[PDB]
Structures are given as C-alpha cells and as structure tokens.
Amino acid sequence: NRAPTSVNAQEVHRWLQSFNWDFKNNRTKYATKYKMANETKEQFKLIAKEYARMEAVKDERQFGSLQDALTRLNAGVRVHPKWNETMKVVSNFLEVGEYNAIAATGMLWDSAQAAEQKNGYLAQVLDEIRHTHQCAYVNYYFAKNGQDPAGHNDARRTRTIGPLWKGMKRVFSDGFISGDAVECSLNLQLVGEACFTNPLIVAVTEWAAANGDEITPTVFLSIETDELRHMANGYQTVVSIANDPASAKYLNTDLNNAFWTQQKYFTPVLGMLFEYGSKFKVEPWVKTWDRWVYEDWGGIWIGRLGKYGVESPRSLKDAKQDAYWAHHDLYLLAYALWPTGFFRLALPDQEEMEWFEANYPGWYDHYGKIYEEWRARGCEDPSSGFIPLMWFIENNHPIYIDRVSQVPFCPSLAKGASTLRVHEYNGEMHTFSDQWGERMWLAEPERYECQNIFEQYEGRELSEVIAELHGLRSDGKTLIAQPHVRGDKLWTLDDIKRLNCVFKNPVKAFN
Amino acid sequence: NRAPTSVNAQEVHRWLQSFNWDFKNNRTKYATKYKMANETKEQFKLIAKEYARMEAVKDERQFGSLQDALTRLNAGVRVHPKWNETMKVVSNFLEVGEYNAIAATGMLWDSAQAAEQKNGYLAQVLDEIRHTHQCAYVNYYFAKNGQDPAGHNDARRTRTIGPLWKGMKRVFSDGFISGDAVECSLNLQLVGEACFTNPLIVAVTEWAAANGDEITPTVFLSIETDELRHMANGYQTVVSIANDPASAKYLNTDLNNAFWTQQKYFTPVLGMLFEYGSKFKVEPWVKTWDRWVYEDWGGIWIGRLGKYGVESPRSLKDAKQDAYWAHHDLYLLAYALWPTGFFRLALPDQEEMEWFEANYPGWYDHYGKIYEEWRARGCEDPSSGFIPLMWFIENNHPIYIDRVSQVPFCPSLAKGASTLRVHEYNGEMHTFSDQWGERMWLAEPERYECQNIFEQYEGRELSEVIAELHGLRSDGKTLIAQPHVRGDKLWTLDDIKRLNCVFKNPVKAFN
Amino acid sequence: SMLGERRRGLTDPEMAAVILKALPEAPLDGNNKMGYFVTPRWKRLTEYEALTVYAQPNADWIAGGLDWGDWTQKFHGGRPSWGNETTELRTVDWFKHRDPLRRWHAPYVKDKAEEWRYTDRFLQGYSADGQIRAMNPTWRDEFINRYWGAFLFNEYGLFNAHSQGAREALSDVTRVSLAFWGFDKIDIAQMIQLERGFLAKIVPGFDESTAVPKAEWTNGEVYKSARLAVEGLWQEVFDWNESAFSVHAVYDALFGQFVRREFFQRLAPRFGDNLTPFFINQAQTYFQIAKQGVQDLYYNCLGDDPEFSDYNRTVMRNWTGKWLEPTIAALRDFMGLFAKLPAGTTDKEEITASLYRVVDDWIEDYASRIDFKADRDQIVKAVLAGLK
Amino acid sequence: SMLGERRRGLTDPEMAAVILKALPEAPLDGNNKMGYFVTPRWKRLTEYEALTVYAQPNADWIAGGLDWGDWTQKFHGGRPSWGNETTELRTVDWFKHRDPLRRWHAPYVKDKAEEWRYTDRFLQGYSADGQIRAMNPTWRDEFINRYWGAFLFNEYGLFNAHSQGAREALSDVTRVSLAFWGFDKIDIAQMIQLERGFLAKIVPGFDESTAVPKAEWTNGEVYKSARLAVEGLWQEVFDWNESAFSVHAVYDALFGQFVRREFFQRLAPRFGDNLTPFFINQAQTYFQIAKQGVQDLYYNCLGDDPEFSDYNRTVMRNWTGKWLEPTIAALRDFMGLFAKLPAGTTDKEEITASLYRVVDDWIEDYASRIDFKADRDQIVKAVLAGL
Amino acid sequence: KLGIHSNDTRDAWVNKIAQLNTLEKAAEMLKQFRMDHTTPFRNSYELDNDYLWIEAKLEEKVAVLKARAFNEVDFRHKTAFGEDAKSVLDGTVAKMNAAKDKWEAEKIHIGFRQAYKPPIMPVNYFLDGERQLGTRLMELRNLNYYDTPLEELRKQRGVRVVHLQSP
C-alpha cells in the first residue's frame, strides 16, 4: 500500500496534553490566588506549523491589498483630515494593548499547568505579536503615504507628552500584566477583548470606511479573524479555576475591578475618538455603548459564565450613570490641552453641532456654546495668544488626574460625574474621580503611584516640555499637535512659548 | 569555516548552456527556413525555482487585492456598463492569445538549439500559462461579482457565434503557431507583443481605470511585469538567425507578412473596443495608432534591429492609409450583427458623436447619420422587428469576410479601404479586402481555407443559430447579446425569430 | 501632486456619479459562475477547471472541441494548427483529463517557490551546522560530483522531450499538465547542479564545472544506454503522447526510479550524505505528483475511454514494448556503477531486491493498467547481466 | 442589493467630494518615515526595526526607555510591570538587540508556513514512493519511536522555559526573538510526534501514543540527567536572561546539538532512514537561526556593552559554569544509548570525533565569546566516561 | 436537421462509416474522402461545412481497424496500405528535393498529406515528413516573394478573376 499519506494538526494535537510531565517544581512562577486545573482543554487543536499557515494566508491578502490596489487608488491620502489624525491615536494606542497582551498571554502561558491551556495561550502570544506589527503597519502606511506623517511616524515617543496616553497604559499595558495572572486575564480577555476590544475593532473599520479610510479596514478586519481563539482563552481561564474554592471567594471582585478599570477609560475615550475624530458619523456612542456593555457583554456574554459562579459586575449600574456625558466632558479637556498631543484636533462644524444636539439634547447649551466662545476668541489662530486651558484657569475649573485610572476629570464643569475625593497620605496628595477607584487605592496604595502630568510638568513652561519630548514636526519649529485640521496657520513652538503657560499641580490649592 | 552559505539562480545558470549535448538527431522537429545559432544566449539568468518565486510574489499581491480590498469596495460592480461588456471581449480574446502563445513558445523552445535560448523561451511558456489563467480570472471575477455575468461566464463557447472571433484566432492563435517557427515568432513577439500587445495591455488599464474598472488594472499591470523577458526572446530570435544566409533571403518577407497580419486585425478592432466600448475616453485611436505603429514600433524598436538586416515593413504605408477610418467602418458591422455576439453594444450618445466628429472630421455625415436612422428604425427596441443588417440588405450593402484575415468588410459602405477582389478557384469563391492578403492566398491557398460565418450559416434562420450555439442567458430566452446596455427591454430569442432573418452567402451573387 | 492628475472612475466623484447612474438595479443574469457549462470531475466545479477547461479554441472535429470550422491560418502544405494527426491515440473528448492535484499556474509556482526558499534556508543551515564534515570524501568527489552530476543530463533530456508536446497537446488540461511535468524535470537537473555549486563553496577544491559530469554522460559506460534511450525519446519520437507516456510510464518509472531511489537515495545515507537526499526528496515528490496526472490521462481517460479503450491500450502496449527494451539496456549499463563502489557498500542480493521493488511498483502503477504482460524475473535477470 | 446600503468615503461621490475638499495641497510634513528616530543597525532603517523598536512603553528608568514616570498599575506589593529587577544583566540600552534575520511576525509565519506545506507534500510523496521499505525495523520501532520520541519532551521542556521570558523581557526586539526561539522549540516537539504519527499510518503495527516515549523520558535512564537539567532550566530559574542564555548558549548547544546532529542525524542515515533527517533538517535550520539572535543579544549587545561588558561577561561565565555541569551530566547519561545499538553501528573513535565537533563548535560559537576558558579534552573525557 | 454541430450530412456519414468493417475498405474510403473533400485541390466543395468532422470519424474507424489487424512492428512501421513508411517518407522527400520550383513543391506536399495523413502513415513518420517537406516548400515559396505582380500571380495560380474593385 503506497497511497499518498500525511498527518495534520489535529492528529498531533491529539497527544499534546501528554507533553507535560510531573516534577516537584512544576508550578507557575507568578503570584496568584487561583488554581488552574491541570487537565483543562483548549478549543482549537493547533500545532505551531498550522498556526503559521493560517496566519500567513491572511497576511497575503492584507499586504497584497495594501501594496497593490490600495496604493494604486491613493487610499492613504483620500481620507478625511480628522480621521487621518484619529488613526494616529487609535492605531498606536491599540498597538500597546496588542504589545502588552504578548506579555500577558506569556504570563498566562506560564500560569496554565495543562499543556493544552498553555498551547491556547501560546497561540495568542503569537497573535498579539502579529497584531502589534499590524497596528504598527497602519501607522507606518499612513506615515509613508498619508496627508500628515507627523505623529504616525513617531507616536512611540510623542505619545508620552499627553495625558490620554497615561490612561491607555493603565487599561492596555499595566492592567494586562501587573497583578494576579487571573486578574490580568480578566482585564485582557474576559472584559477587555470580549466587551471592548473586539466590538471596537469592527466599529473602527466602520467609522474608517465612512471617512474614506480603506487602509484600516484591510488591517483591522484581518486582526478580527484571530479573535475567536482569544475569546476561548478567556472563557477557558474561568473554566480552569471554576472548581478551585478560592474562585468563589475572589473571582467576582477581580472581575468587577477589571470591568471598572476598562470601562473607566474606554467609555469616555472611545466615544470621543468616534464622534469627535470623524466627519461622517456611523452611530451615536450612547447607543453603541449600551449595546456593547449592557446587551452584548453584561447580558449574553457574562450570562453564559453564570454556571461558573460569574456574576454581573456590581459596579455596572454606576458605570451606566457616569457614562452618558463622559466622552463629551473629556473632549473639552483634550482640546483645551491640545498642545500636549501628537495629533491634530478640530472643533465641531455646523452639521456636527446639529448632529450632537439631535443625539444628545442639551449638548449645544453646554459644549456647543463653549466651543463657539473659544473659536470666536481665536483658539484656532496662532496670533490670538489663546489656548483653552487658559479659559479653565480664568473660570476656576481645575483639571485633575485620577490617581488610579489616570483619566482626566473636571468636577466643576462636568455635565456628567462631578464627585471628587482628595486625600493626603505620608506627605502626598491624591485625587479620585469615583468610589471604585478610591477603594482600589485605599486597599492597594503601593499598586498606584503613577505621577500625573501636572506633577511631572509642575513649574515647567509648556513649550519646553514639548520641545524636550520632541513634539515638533520636521522643520523643528511647527508643532505636531494643532487646534484645527486645515493646512495653513499651523502653530509653532514660538506661538506656544509666547503664551507663557506654566503647569501647576491643581491639588496644591487645597493646602 | 561554517559561514551560512547558499547558491542563487545566476550561479546555476552560469552552467546551463552546457546542459545540451551533441548527437546526430539533435535538431528541431519543425519545418523552418532558418538556423538558430547554437550558442545564442539569453538575457535573464533564471532557473525554475527562482522563476516560480518571482511570479508567486506577484500573484500574492494580485489575488490579495482582488479577494480583499477590491471585493470590499464592490469594484466588480461599480464599472460603466459599456466597459463591463468591453472586458468580456478584451479579456477572453486576449486569453486565447496568451494560450496559443504557450504552444508557440513550446515550438520556439523546440526550434532553439542553444540551451540558454531554449530556457528563455521556456520561461515564456510558463508565463503564457500564467497569462491565460490571469485573463480567465478577469472574466471569472466579473462573472462572479459583476452587473452582467452572461458572456463573462461562457465566452469560451459563446464567442464561436460571432465573426469578430474568427479574426482573433488568425492573429492570436493560428498566426502564433502555424507556419515557420520564425514566422510565428514574428507574429507573436517581434510584431504582436512589441507593436500591439504590450502597448495595448497598458492602454487597457488606463481606459479601465477611467471607466471605474480597477479589476483589470490589478491583473493586467501584473501581466505587464513579465513582458521584458518576452521582448528579449523576440529580439534574441532575430540575433540567433542573423548570421545565416537564409536570413537575408527570407526575414523581411516573413516580417512584412507578420506585420500586415497583426495590423489588419488590431488596427480596426482595438480602436473599436476603445472608442465605442467606453463611456469616458482616454485618447483618440488615430493618434494612439500613429504613436504605437509608426513611431514606437516602426521607428525606434524596428530601427534597433537594422544591424541584423531587419527593415521597416514594406506594407507600413498601406497600413497607415487604411487605418484612419478602419475602426469606424467595423463598428457599423459589429453593431449591425449584434445578435451574433456574447456582449451588449450601444449606439454613440449625443455627447459621444460630438467627440467623434471633433476627433474625426466627417464622422457625423457618414456614421452619425446612419446610427440616427437605425435609432429611428427602433434598433434598440425589441418590438421594432428591426436589426441593422436588414438596413444593409435594403440598401444593397453586402458584407464580405476576408478569406485570409477573417476581418469583415463592406466596400460599398466604407470611408476607409473600398477595394474588393473576387476570385473563383477549383469550384470555390474567395473574397479579399487588400493586396497583401490576396498575395498570401494566391501563393499559399492551402494555408487559408477558413469557412466564414455566411458560408457556415447559409440558409440558416438567425434565431436557430444563436440557440444551437447557446447564445442565451440562464432564463433560456433572453439573448446574451443586446443592441443597448440598459437594464430593461432586453431582446429575447423570440424577438429575433420574429425578424425571420436568414443568412445568405454574399459571394453567390457573382456569376 | 499628492492627489495625482489622473482621475479614476471608482473614486472620482463626477465620473463615479455618471457610472452609478447607468447601472442596472440588479445583475442582468443570476448565473455568476464562469465555466458553469463544464462537466465537473468532482462534486462541484473547481477554480482549476473553470480557469482552464476550453481555453483551447478547438473546433468539434478535434474530439471534445466546442468551436466550428477550420483554422484561420495553417502551415505551408496545409497542416492544421492542432489536429488529430499529431498522435496515434484517439478519444471521445480531449478535455476529460484532470490533474488530480488541480494545478493551474498560481498554485504551481506557489509550491515551487516554497520549496525554493526553504531549500535556501536548509543550505544556510547545513553549511552553518558544518554537517559536511562527516561526509565520506570518495562518495562526495566521485559519486556525487561525477555520477549524480551526470544524471542531470538524463533529467535535462527528459525535460526537452516535452518541447513538442507543449506545442501539440490537444487540450488545455493536457497542455498544462505536460508543461508542468517538463518544468519539474528541468528543475531537478538544476537542483543537481545547485548541489554541485553548493559543494564547491563549502568544500575547498570541489569544481562545480559540468565538464566532468558531462564527459561521464556523453562518453562514459555507466550511462551509455541511458543516454541512447533519452536521445531517442526526445528526438526520434514525433508523437506527443508516445513521448509523455513512454517517458513517464516506462523509462523514468523504471530507470529513473532506480537511479534516484534505489542507488543514490538508498546509498547516500551510508556515506554520511544527507545533502543529496534533500534534493532527491524533491525529485521523488515531483515524480509522484506527475504520476497521478500521467495515470489520469493515459489510464483513466485514454486507456479506459468508453469508445477507444481497447484501441488505446493496444497502442500503449505497443509503446511499452518498444521502450521497455531500451530501458532495460539503460538499467543494464547502470549496473556497472556498483563495481565502482568501495567494497562492502552493498551486494548482489540488495541490488536484486531493489530492482524488484522498482519493477513491481512499475507493474502495479503502470503495466497492469493497460494489461501489459510484464514478467518481473525476466526483466530483472536481463538487467542483472550488467553486473560486473 | 447589488450596491449595498453602506456608503464608503472613498467611492461615494458626495462623501468623497467633502473629503477631497478638506484635504491640504500637500502633506503637512515631508518626513514620511515611521521610526525615523530609531538608530539603524544597518545602512538604512529596515521594516523590521520600524515596526518593532520602541513598541514596549518603557520609561527611561529601564535602560533605553523613552517614556517617563512609574507604571500606572503594579503588582500587589509594588512590583513593577517590567523592571531592572527581573534579571542580573545590565545594559546601556535594552533596545540595542537586533535579530540578524530581521524577523517580525509576517516573515516568521511565512517561512514556517512554507515548511509546513512542503512537509505535507514530502510525506505524501514518501508514502507513495514506498521509501519506508528500506528502513531498518529495529531502528524504527526502537530508536526512533522510543528514544527519538522521548527527546520530544526535552524540546517541549525547553519550549516552556521561555514562558517567563515572554512575560519579563525588557524590550520588544528581545521579546520577539525570545518568543520565536520558544515557538520553534514546540514546533520541533510537535514534528517529532508528527513523524511518529506518520509511521503509525504507514507501518501497520506502529503505535503513535506518547506512552512509551514519555515513560522513557520520565523513568528512563538515557535522558535522566537531561530531564533533570530541563526541569531546572525551566522551573528553577526566574531570571529571563539566565534561562535563554543557559538554554541556548549552553545546554541545547551541547546536549541538544549532540543528540540531534551527532546521534540521530548521523546514525539514522545508516539504517535507511531519511525520514527522521527530514525533520532534523528543520530543527537544525531553526537552531542555526536562533543562534544568530542568541549571539547578537548576549555577545554583541550585553557581552560587549560599552558600560557593562566586564560585568555581564562575569555573570554569563558564572551561568556557563553553573549549567555546564548539568549539561555534561546529561551528555553522560546519554552515552549509555550507544550500548543499545546493534553491533557495528558505530565505534568509540567516531563518537569521540563527534563530541569534539560539538564541544569545538560550542567553544568557537559561545564559550570564547565571553572569555569562558573551557577545556575541550576534559569535557569530552568527562562525557566519554559514560560509555 | 441542418445544425452546425449536428445535421443529416454528418448522420449520413456516421452510418456509412459504421459499415466499414475491414481495414482495406476503410482505409481506401478515407483516402478517397481526402481526395474528394480536402485541400484547395479537392474534387468538390460540397461537404465544406462538415468534411473536417467527417474525416475525423473516418480516421477513428481506420485507426481502430489497423490496431486490430497489424502486428506491433507493422503498426509502428507500415502504412495502413501495407507500404513501408520509411520508404514512402524517404521517396517523397527525395522528390521534394528534386522539385524544380514552388509549384511542383506544393503539389508534392499537399498530395502527401491527402494520401498519407496519420491514420494511414504512422504519426512519427508523417510528422518527420511535415518537417522536411514543409522546409523545402517554404524555401522555394518565400524566395523573391513579392517580385511577381498580382496581375501575373493570379494567372500563375490559375484563378478566374470574377470581380475587381479599387478606389
């Protein structure tokens, strides 16, 4: 018998579970309260070689479209200015999420004892590396072929100037790798990807296409195809510890803490990037958020984990109350601090203001009037000597940074949440924006010592910080960041220096 | 020393010329007046493995663009109707040229005695298989994702119904493989590709892009990347035979015949597909032709070969004289016989007639008026009971088929050439449209015995022919071919049957 | 400029608007399957079939053709562009053949390219790993450089035997399969040289020139009859099917398989040579791929033709006998090489058993398919006479 | 519908017009090179560097970082997400490393995918060609199944040793190389099982179960010192650099290379086995690829660090010494395998020459890089005593 | 029944061919058919639209009959008429090389095809003939190809000029 014969992935994976053997020190090297069953199985029966093949095939299509048809169509250029800027943040911020996920799944791979569960996490380790490079490619492509390379070309260092980056690291960097492996698994997979990341990636391709961007859909839709393996990983994480008695005592709290951590940042940030970083709208963020968080995640997803003792996050009701105006409240701060970014922002045009009011009754009387006031005052013109941060100072509206989530908040102006808790402990002041974050710090002060921008930049003149952190374009004079998206009247380092803006730690006013 | 080392294609190719060895019967199996030099060399130092890699890279980008971005953009649909129809003919007709080129180069590979020259032809054999499959893919893609699949989905059998197909087989099928290997090389490489095919492929991507088609550019631009090798093969053929006494005696004669053969079909057909098969125009055919045939080919390219005894074709002047109105004279015939095609045609619209009249003074007084009358006769309406062919009969304008080139012509109604030569020979009548083709037949009667559509369809009712050869849409009643490109009022087999059009062989009128 | 000067109908607002306006509300035909009229070999029509079948414009007078009428231009004398007269074999339809591996151009160059890049990685790993150190010097300098090298000309000759077929094949599916069978042969000849070139780089003094291997092929004794058979198959056969059939279902199936598998593949390892087997693995993979196509065309389609089955088998039986003798002669002369080996390398029993493996495989995969009455011990005994 | 309901800004006339109207006349910065601020290792910046370097958000307090401030969230206790405290090695810049092969995800899976599909093709041809007919039955059912298979647990173990490194690596370029080194190891282990699975299909009485090979690994005697050395490199080492260094520049470079290249890749051919070598060719290709990266990190970067050259070489010489013993021990326990080979398979003269090949390659490729003075004769002598 | 691919004429010849159950009779009919219906020298153009297809059907029968009647050596080296193929090939090439002009040459080549096309002569010999005969025919025909005026070429070919038209 000489019939052509071979062997596939499933046939090898069949005996993968037996690859691991017993010996005294065969245990995780990371602190954890849980015990992952040493017989846990994985959903996809893959071996290294088949994994590569299925991913290589996707790369083919993706890079083929990018290098050929899309380039021939000048797809990198024919994108709305506002969206070109938005993608600088979306792609780079997600990049770090993808990157730390490599470390996270590495930690999870070390945590799992069953060979198959380790193999499941391993596949994501590789996927996360692919995603890091994909998000990197989007910025690389828009830098090479876009209308404004600045920011796209150096976000890895220019992002350190702004406050939005700090919070991104909390949810997509540190939140993914610092803590109980299982807690990280919850931030990354059970909450992060299942509730936000996945729905977000697809949504982004929708807003991208609406604004002329066919580059992002080509890359992000490819990333999306890898998500079923990660959902399984997250789901299997729970199944792996469901039996352990410690689970009943700890799972729900790590989850709740994980849910709050992630929503605290994405609730305001995502809505902002979608509604304010685009010209053409796809759907109101309030509607989107409700579907994602309450219907899809909080309901169907969390529901299926019920048999494993998983319960709806106790802070869910709170998240919904704080959500409504969250993104609108944050854009005011983001724009007021525009010189600290690595992207260009625009104020809502007339059609947009109408869209905002139609979808968020009351929007115009608060946010709309403020933007028109700032614009008439010349916030878009470099010879005006006006930056919106000045307006906040003039009207005594201090801006704080939550010590835990790193999210900026202005309780005196906010149409949304306006709670503020300030504490002093061993010679250091702390500001919190909600009761959940306050507890985290109170219970785990050593986990949260992140210095905020006001602390680091205290006493420093704005232009010096920008210059030092390389917030300049090629000519070494024009700022990367801008308060408008037009091609003329770009602000320069000198236009900022003349403002004589000096940072102050707002918390010291309580002394 | 264990330094990472390997071997590339050139390093192996260095010894390829020595692969062939001597023995009594090592000679071509094909009849030829020429002797290809035993030590002829090739331009590109390739080996099978490297050839495969460079082509595989191209396929990757091509299919990636087609399957991903282009499909997501609905590129198969957003193309002007006229162009969707034009590509049915362009892609499938070129397909056969690509296909016969496989056999043609297999024949040259057999002809060549030097291993390197055989290898050069070999690479084209493989390229032509690629091009066959590529052209097939264009039709395949438009059938799968376009506005009108009929024709795109079965051209390989529906093209046999019409007269334009016969001429295509002469220049791109039989002309490529039947005759002296060198003669075939002239039709294929020295004339066909150099003068028409290469320039045509590029031009098609421009017209395609202008009409919304990004599918064809993706494939055809990839086809074009392989042409340098093919040009080298053509040039090398001349070099390999230049030092042979037979060359001075026969080369220019086979070249002149080849030139006339190719020009006779493409001069009128290309201009027709370009100008009449499109909405948006790129450039008038008159100027395109002069640049292609007279300047680029019959000047620059042809000159470079003067050192090998190659001279400008003696029939070049006649070609130009007959060229001017050629494509215009032909569209009148293709439209009049629209029920015999596998594509939908349209009358020039008001805006188009202006362009035609502007670029071809006198066009309106001749063709314009004729189309307006056919329009009035209801040539576009199924209930009119009218087909332009009837008009030719009523006005005694017989349409003949050149016995040699298969190109249809109406000498009584043509602004271009109006010569007609009719001979009787051993019980058969033959009709020629020019002095070059007439000479070909008189000297080589047994090479040209192709029966024409009138001879084959004589006494046959039109609807019966269309039905027998599967010229219908999937509903089994609506014709594939149409006299207009609109979505309603499509002609049915019954509409044709009612016309009771019965073919007659025009030459039988002669005594 | 950033935007460019050329306007595209897909993205230019004005032009796209014009295009969208002329579009129908829905496709003018729901049958969006190119090649729908082709009779599928398998469950559903394959991309391989759609893109290939009927590309060849044959008229009905060439079995299976869908066109009508004579060719537009023929050879001086009247010879048709393609015609029944170019082969003794007859069939109900020349388009019935299907490559079991369904290889059209794209999948074909993709796999070869994978093999090329991996080959390069392998060689870089082999050289860096210094594995050449344990290869027997005599095997390397004598048997690889001279005898394996001379075999490149055998494969080169079989490659060339396909030139006429590339021109005469009576259908697209057969032309594509034939082209690929031939292209794989030149690839192997080039991989033999590739190995010699590699050895010249990592082994001081090794000469990559083909002079020695070529002199062995053209004037040596070991390959004399092999070369005579190759010269015949290539240049004395004017029938494209006799050529493909005799090369793949007779000569290469017996002589080729014996040399590659029962001599070099079998003995190289005994001399610490894992380098040559790397390339023979490719040759054998190619051999087995081509076999499936060869079997489908000659046995499934022609040998089992509903109308010409008996006739075609008679002819292939004729060809088998015609070429079996020259093939036995080739194997017979090749037996002389065993005497050149260092004592104790192998013996008469191993050699005989290896001959039987090739003969038995041939009878099962080819001879039996056309009822050719092959006598295995008679063939083996005839070959053994060449053992010095 | 034929056109669909969704309107796209690139093709929709109305939306596209609005977009084109907002576009600037020319790019707002001529510098269209992402990663332009990265120091090129070669002539011009490569795609590999642009897409990888600085992806890790390290602050300046982690040698090379470009960010500032503490991490946002840390471990209970205060342990940083990534910190200098996770490895004894120090450097002026953790982003200096560069994979000689410049592998980011795409090229990496492209190459492994080519190997996978060619592997499949090879197997289909090998079986159809009946090449199994000439393989020594004992070598198959005993040395390939039991001893080669058992070695899959060695590679698998080395694979897992990279788990902590995947989590603790202090830079992107190093994390990617590490992840690829480990993934290749699991690949090899899965390839060993793949072969056993293939043999199971073409050889009627062959059992693919890992039971026999596992028992050999866990309770056997041939790989005893080997397994002990693996369990230690994997679960007793908490310094990600000590794990990678010791695994690749010590253990696998001595034991692993000997077993794969000097035992199976050298003896399999003598039993009519070109199958196993087909997979070892992959394992060796992978080994030589990883080696270039291992060398660039610990020698070109750390070992030759402009500020910690002496320091790092000391730590590595210490590690080399620390693990050279368990490795030599592993080689000794392995020597016992030759006694189970059929008489006349090989002699002491050959094995001695093979060991020196391994030891000499090791010295030239690793030991001499950090000024580690190893004695070839004493090592071979120490190992050879296991016969 | 007057179709392109299926008609009474073709049906009529299929029945006729079905009654050719002897090699000698079948082979003689095929050769007769070729003299009567192929090449520009055919005795008649009555079967112009179907002769190509009918010829193939005739060839099929002759081939099948020849394979049954001839031993292996003859199938390879004899024509269906029992002639030695090599002798016929050589004899025809000799005549071709003695041809005094392109007119004599075309008759030799064309006549060879009508009489020996493959089912009759083994393909190997027939295509070797195409190679040699074709070469000489072209050499003679392509020498000073344009020297003879059309007016005179028409006379040499012997056509009856029916109608001439020109601007």
Ligand SMILES: [Ca+2]
């Ligand atoms: Ca008459």
Ligand SMILES: [Ca+2]
């Ligand atoms: Ca013996």
Ligand SMILES: [Ca+2]
């Ligand atoms: Ca017997």
Ligand SMILES: [Fe+2]
């Ligand atoms: Fe991801």
Ligand SMILES: [Fe+2]
């Ligand atoms: Fe994910």
Ligand SMILES: [Fe+2]
């Ligand atoms: Fe081509």
Ligand SMILES: [Fe+2]
């Ligand atoms: Fe070409």
